[PDB]
Amino acid sequence: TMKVGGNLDSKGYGIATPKGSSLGTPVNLAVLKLSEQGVLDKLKNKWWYDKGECGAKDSGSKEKTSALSLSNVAGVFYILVGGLGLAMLVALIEFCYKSR
């Protein structure tokens, strides 16, 4: 399962308290101080980006090949077999030209 599209909004999260709770100002000051300390992105690495343990981290760009296969080029055989059908049909109709 996959992200498609993108953000509809410049919205975000915040810490929240009862209205007028004394925690709001120390919370907000700590939130500011954390930003220049760079904690928030390192928490985000720890909870999303390091946990990108699936091969989808890499599988879309890896080197070399498992060799090429018929199904990738099989249509080339169709135009041949159709040419051989035409090579029969031409004789099948030129019979009536020689029959003239």
Partner 1 sequence: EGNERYEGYCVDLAAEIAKHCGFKYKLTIVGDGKYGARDADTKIWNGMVGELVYGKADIAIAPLTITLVREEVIDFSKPFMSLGISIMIKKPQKSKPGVFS
Partner 2 sequence: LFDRGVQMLLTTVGAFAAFSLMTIAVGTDYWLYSRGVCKTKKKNEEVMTHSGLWRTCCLEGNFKGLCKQIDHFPEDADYEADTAEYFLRAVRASSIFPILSVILLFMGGLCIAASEFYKTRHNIILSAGIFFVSAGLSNIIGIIVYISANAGKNSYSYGWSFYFGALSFIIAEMVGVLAVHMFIDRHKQLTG
Partner 3 sequence: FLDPLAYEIWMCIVFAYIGVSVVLFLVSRFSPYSESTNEFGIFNSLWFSLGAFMQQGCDISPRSLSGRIVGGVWWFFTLIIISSYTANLAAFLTVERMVSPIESAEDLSKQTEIAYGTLDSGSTKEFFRRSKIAVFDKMWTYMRSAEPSVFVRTTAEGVARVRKSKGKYAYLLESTMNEYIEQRKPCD
Ligand X SMILES: NS(=O)(=O)c1cc2c(cc1Cl)N[C@H]([C@H]1C[C@H]3C=C[C@@H]1C3)NS2(=O)=O
Residues 16-45 binding partner 2 (CB under 8 A) are: none
Structure tokens at 74: 């099989």
Binding of partner 3 by 8 (CB under 8 A): yes
SS3 98: helix
Q: Considering only 9-17, 26-34, 47-55, 83-91, which stretch makes contact with partner 2 by CB under 8 A?
A: 83-91
CB of 93 to partner 1, least distance (A): 27
Structure tokens at 55: 């091969």
Among partner 1, ligand X, partner 3, none, residue 97 binds (CB under 5-8 Å by kind): none
How many residues appear in the chain? 100
- For residue 81, the tally of other CB atoms under 10 A from its CB is 9
